[PDB]
From a paper:
The hemagglutinin (HA) surface glycoprotein promotes viral entry through its receptor binding and membrane fusion functions, and mutations in HA have been shown to modulate the pathogenicity, host range specificity, transmissibility, and pandemic potential of influenza viruses. HA is synthesized as a trimeric HA0 protein that must be activated for membrane fusion by post-translational cleavage into a high-energy HA1/HA2 complex. Upon internalization, the virus is exposed to progressively lower pH values until a threshold is reached that triggers HA to undergo irreversible conformational changes that mediate membrane fusion. Here, we provide biochemical and x-ray crystallographic evidence that naturally occurring amino-acid variations at the interface of the vestigial esterase and fusogenic stalk domains alter HA acid stability for highly pathogenic H5N1 influenza, resulting in a shift in the threshold pH required to activate HA protein structural changes that cause membrane fusion.
To gain insights into the structural basis for altered HA acid stability, we determined the crystal structures of the prefusion forms of the MP and HP HA proteins. One crystal form of the MP HA protein was obtained at pH 8.5, and two crystal forms of the HP HA protein were obtained at pH 6.6, all above the low pH thresholds for conformational changes for the two proteins. Comparing the midpoints of conformational changes, MP HA had a value of pH 5.3 whereas HP HA had a value of 5.7, showing that HP HA is less acid stabile than MP HA. In MP HA, E216 makes a hydrogen bond with neighboring RBD backbone amide R212, although this hydrogen bond is found only in two of the three E216 residues in the HA trimer. The lack of hydrogen bonding by the third E216 could be biologically relevant, helping to destabilize HA, or could be due to a crystallographic artifact. However, the presence of an E216 residue did not seem to have a dominant effect in the context of MP HA, which contains six other mutations and has an overall decreased pH of fusion compared to HP HA. We hypothesize that the negatively charged D104 in HP HA forms less favorable interactions with the neighboring L73 at the top of the HA2 coil in the prefusion conformation than does the polar N104 in MP HA. Overall, we suggest that the combination of D104N and I115T mutations found in MP HA promotes the stabilization of the 110-helix and thereby stabilizes the prefusion form of the HA protein, lowering its pH of activation and, consequently, attenuating the virus.
Residue numbers in the entry:
A (entry chain E), B (entry chain A): 9 to 19, 19A, 20 to 28, 31 to 35, 35A, 36 to 53, 53A, 54 to 82, ...
C (entry chain C): 10 to 19, 19A, 20 to 28, 31 to 35, 35A, 36 to 53, 53A, 54 to 82, ...
D (entry chain B): 1 to 170
E (entry chain D): 1 to 172
F (entry chain F): 1 to 173
The structure:
Amino acid sequence: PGDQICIGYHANNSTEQVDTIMEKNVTVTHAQDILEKTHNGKLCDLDGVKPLILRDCSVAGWLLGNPMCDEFINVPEWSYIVEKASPANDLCYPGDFNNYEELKHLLSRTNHFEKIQIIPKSSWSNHDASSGVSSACPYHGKSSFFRNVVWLIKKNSAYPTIKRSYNNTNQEDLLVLWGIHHPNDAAEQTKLYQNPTTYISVGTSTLNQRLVPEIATRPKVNGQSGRMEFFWTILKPNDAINFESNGNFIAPEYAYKIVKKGDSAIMKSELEYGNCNTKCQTPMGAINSSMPFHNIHPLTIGECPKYVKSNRLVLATGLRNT
Amino acid sequence: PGDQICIGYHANNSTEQVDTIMEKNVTVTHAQDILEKTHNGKLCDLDGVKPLILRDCSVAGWLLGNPMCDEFINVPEWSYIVEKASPANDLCYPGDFNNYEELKHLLSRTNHFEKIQIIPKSSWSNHDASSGVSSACPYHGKSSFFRNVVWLIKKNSAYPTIKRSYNNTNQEDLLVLWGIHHPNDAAEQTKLYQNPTTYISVGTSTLNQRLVPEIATRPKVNGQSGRMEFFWTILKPNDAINFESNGNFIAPEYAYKIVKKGDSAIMKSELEYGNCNTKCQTPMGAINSSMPFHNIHPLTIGECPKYVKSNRLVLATGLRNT
Amino acid sequence: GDQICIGYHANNSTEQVDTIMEKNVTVTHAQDILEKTHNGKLCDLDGVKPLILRDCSVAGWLLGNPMCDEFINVPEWSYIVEKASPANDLCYPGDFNNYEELKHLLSRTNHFEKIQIIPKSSWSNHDASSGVSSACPYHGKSSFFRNVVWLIKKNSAYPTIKRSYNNTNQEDLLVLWGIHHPNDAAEQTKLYQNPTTYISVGTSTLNQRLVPEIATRPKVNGQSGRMEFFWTILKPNDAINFESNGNFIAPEYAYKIVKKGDSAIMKSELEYGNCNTKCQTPMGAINSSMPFHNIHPLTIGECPKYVKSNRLVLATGLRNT
Amino acid sequence: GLFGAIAGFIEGGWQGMVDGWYGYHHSNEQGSGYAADKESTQKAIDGVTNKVNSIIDKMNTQFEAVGREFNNLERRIENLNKKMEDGFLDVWTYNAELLVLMENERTLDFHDSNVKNLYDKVRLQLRDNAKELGNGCFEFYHKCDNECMESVKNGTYDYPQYSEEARLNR
Amino acid sequence: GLFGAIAGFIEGGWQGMVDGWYGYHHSNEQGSGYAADKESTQKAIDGVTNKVNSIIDKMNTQFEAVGREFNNLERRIENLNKKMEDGFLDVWTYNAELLVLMENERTLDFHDSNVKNLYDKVRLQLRDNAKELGNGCFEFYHKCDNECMESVKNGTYDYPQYSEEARLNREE
Amino acid sequence: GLFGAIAGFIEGGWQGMVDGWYGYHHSNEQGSGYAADKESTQKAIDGVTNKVNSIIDKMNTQFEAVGREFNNLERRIENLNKKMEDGFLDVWTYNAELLVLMENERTLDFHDSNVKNLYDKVRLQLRDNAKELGNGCFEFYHKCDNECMESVKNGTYDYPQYSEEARLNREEI
Ligand SMILES: *[C@@H]1O[C@H](CO)[C@@H](O)[C@H](O)[C@H]1NC(C)=O
Ligand SMILES: *[C@@H]1O[C@H](CO)[C@@H](O)[C@H](O)[C@H]1NC(C)=O
Ligand SMILES: *[C@@H]1O[C@H](CO)[C@@H](O)[C@H](O)[C@H]1NC(C)=O
């Protein structure tokens, strides 16, 4: 006569908590954390492709060939590029890199740079190629210079007009670099290039420039009172570049085949290579997670969870615990 | 003894489906679609006002007067402007247009250009205003040039200094265009202009420029190693433009009165005129809809529904169906 | 006989909220969360007074327009107030190079202190006294910018200028200079003797050359000539080098950046309201407890969050009877 | 559903009620038939209509993409322009999709609640003068004519009227 | 509303109950009187308070517009700047207006639900010891003094204690 | 809760019922025990799984920040870049956090609603044949064997076939 059926619900030992609009820290029977909060603190390979870690070199230092940056004289295909906040080795000889940030961006659209010789250094018959060095650009305690460009000096009190051409007879776009030397005074202009009134003219199918050296005394930087200014162009397959100059010309020697284009990045990180592999990389370390969210760093590359700024994101799946 | 009343709800033969956060594809009894997924595939007038379709010409081709753009010699009021991704008829004589993107943006805030003559071709009595033509700009097999600008040559082996000015006494802002020619060598400089060292100077009450040609050795583009650089300014009512030059000057002949400013756009599309009317236009076609949303294309003009990336947007009005 | 009834509150209130499904619902208790009220005044921010430029523009102030002497020496500010179109800007007509970029730097500054970097009397080979214009009058007398010097040839000659200033101070330095653009070749020789001039400026990071651009131009403020002004930030221990054979508008005074911080350039026609606030808009100050306001998007200080709506009311009670 | 009425204790809907969303079905001596509850249906129409309008109105201040052009030395700002415009497109696509989803569920629950409230309106009106079958129907403990059946649809049903007949039957 | 209690089977609110949001009116031998239910009123105050603070907290980290200027050859980026700023402005306006709307409907229903729950708490305590009027009121089949009324409000009403007395009075 | 069942008219949950989220406790002449209602439990698991998935799917197109670099002459644009990226980052942070808060509330109500529906499912299936105890339990006015117990758990109960002995006991009790 005391037969009964009761209706009830699950309860358990769970301590996991969630929030609602109206109540905080509600204990529930089941819950799903959807936020990843950890990383391995290391710069890894991205799907089996090693990044380019420039260490103490900046991009300019790498591309122009600062003699301190000999590690990167020939670089293999990369997945991403890592640069420090303040690289030590930039323009050893002081000056300016024209449109540097635009080149940085193009570089983030690239995976591989194949270096090729376009104007051999032994090819300068009527100009001194070998004595264009500086204490501002030391190598092994000895005066040197950027490896990829040539600082031509007068030969036997003569600097004849240079007329050189190069045809891009390759199948890829070619990054070409050159520069100009701005001397400190009229006396340094004579001693280096003989002619007092000089120029550099550069022409491609899309480029037209005529540079005149700016002779002026500027504060010493790495011992140097003069400056150098660098320029770059993308030369398309079958287009030619023509140089003409009677002084102050920093000629190219090596250029870069853009052999592979794709989704790359310049990461700003003080970290170094971590000998690991990952599918998701941040500037702070790599992520290995099935979570839909993370709060490590906003700037990621690869197949990543979606970045959020919360400390906690826990979804209720079960019910209010007893 | 068996009298009855029952509480019940509607059911019908509707197969319209909605989604919820917990259940997808719920068959509902009344629904409302709020997304337009359809367009007519044509370019039309906006409220009776015809667009300017540039066909195979570009904005620069139109405004400079490329010989191959005579269809746009005098253009009526437009609603929007349509341009192809790669118009064939641009700068017939190779070179660049200075601040081209800013000019296009100003164009997108305009509906009506009226072309007026400011410096008659006949007024050049000490310069050659007839032989400034090129095989880079052919028309019916004859060497020509841009229609709105005059390429001035030396006459009787002489190029006297030019001093010309124009006061804008019209009620409207004036778009004034001019250029400079960069030859490929010092020989070409003398043959065209006589004077070895040249300039073009231009001054309004706000503008101050002095241009100097930059000689370099360049590949041929449309058969020409030379280059032309074009410039522009807005001439305010009651302001004057003063030109001075001793060579390399590409002088204005015609300018444009900005007679109507308003909402406009430079639409990028490979389509052409469809002989229709609409209130809402996309680069893919026109929309005729009472709907609040569409997913056709983000870049619209006129009274349009709001754009979303969705495939289906269906709102439940009725209840769950049996 | 005995009874118990269950029911709810009701009151006299007429306050109203909206739902998705019903507008204008009367409730017993509601909470407004939106400020619509400002005081219409430009006040101090946490007791720090703003810099109110009156009829002077930022350019007028920094260059030393003869009509802006009220601002030759300026104390620490909270924020800066500039009119939409000030009368006292570039008295001698021309341009301020990178002006907008300079204003942005100012919005990250609270304190400028003026110092002399090149004394006006140090120009022995150059006329430093006759570079004055009717375009920049003081009383009704021909004058010029105060912080910058217009050098003219001396004894029919203009020898090459070579100067160097070392920033021995602990603070960054705002350095200003200029170039004059004459109207014709004849004026060049008249003012500077040399036909082909240049100005070279150098720091350890800045490397620029200026060349005059001669052109025929309409009169602005009675002048067909133009002046273009340039600036740079000189870091502590860095030096600046000037080199010129003409057209140079030399610095005399520069600005020590003594305090960097959060600031703004506020566009407002209003003037000082002798008040103090925690939150300031270009239309007035906000004194509020609310989390939202709709006064103006551009604010400074501890402010509620700007929203465009005209009403925001949260229901707290229930449906009234 | 949340209120356990639609496809709950009332297993299905009626094809025979073309009159509205919610209503009644009566069986007595005079005959049988369907009828929609006028007041109940009209309130639910007003609510849904308002919801649809609130949804559209709130979206009238959406982001409008404008085409911009850049040269090939302006690739950084071009990229920034693209990312920002796509950003707002994505944000508003999310807002629209989520709002529709969430309010669909509320619309379904809203109808469920209206049926539940209609059933309770009848139950509290009839008290013990009728039997609760547990399927949405009420069997009367007295004979209720068509005039009596309209009094329950109208709300004004007299309980101290049929108190006698129903009392002695149980 | 959604739960059928407020403006439903209880047709109106009580002007005479100033003590709280929900409560009771009881009339026995010792006179009538309004009284608030403290357990459910405090629960509602706590809920509503938390909701308000939650809305304000979600909006403390929200877009702040900064003034930037441009020259006449920088129209594209000036147009971009303006469009960027107005865009976040509109997005945050939308979020705030929509949050307020959605929560207001929920606050209303929350109250409705509390009222019904309070009513059911009494109904499930009393069972057949009282008659269910059908308008939120219960007629006692026995005599219920002030201390008995308090056990109803306390949630400690002793059903077995009064069931026999209720059974007999009812059967008449 | 919104539906008055979980921590409501049913005071606490059962540590003894590990078979699912909602269910029954029976007690008769042949022993007592716990059994979960598989149907309503599965109905709830599917709803929750789908809710989790649609939350994840709706964030699939959220803002992805790209690092850009600017020089000392591009401070306005560098500042524009930072405020816009942080802008989308704050927006999506709000969307994620607010959606989880709102749905967490709706989930707890969902479970509450389901317990209340299951309770009502039995309630109307028993009619007066049994007695509402007011705590989630029904006391039968008749003998209810294990197959009678699994009759209401299966959802297929005979009200008329039991109304005989039930009415007899109820009239006397
Ligand atoms: C919620 O509980 C946590 C314990 O993890 C505590 O840190 C936090 O302060 C609590 N928050 C509130 C609002 O009580
Ligand atoms: C919903 O069913 C429809 C059938 O038209 C189909 O479009 C959709 O993919 C189905 N979705 C799911 C989630 O079952
Ligand atoms: C709400 O009531 C106000 C009273 O001030 C009125 O102005 C407004 O039109 C009403 N809105 C609607 C949607 O009825």
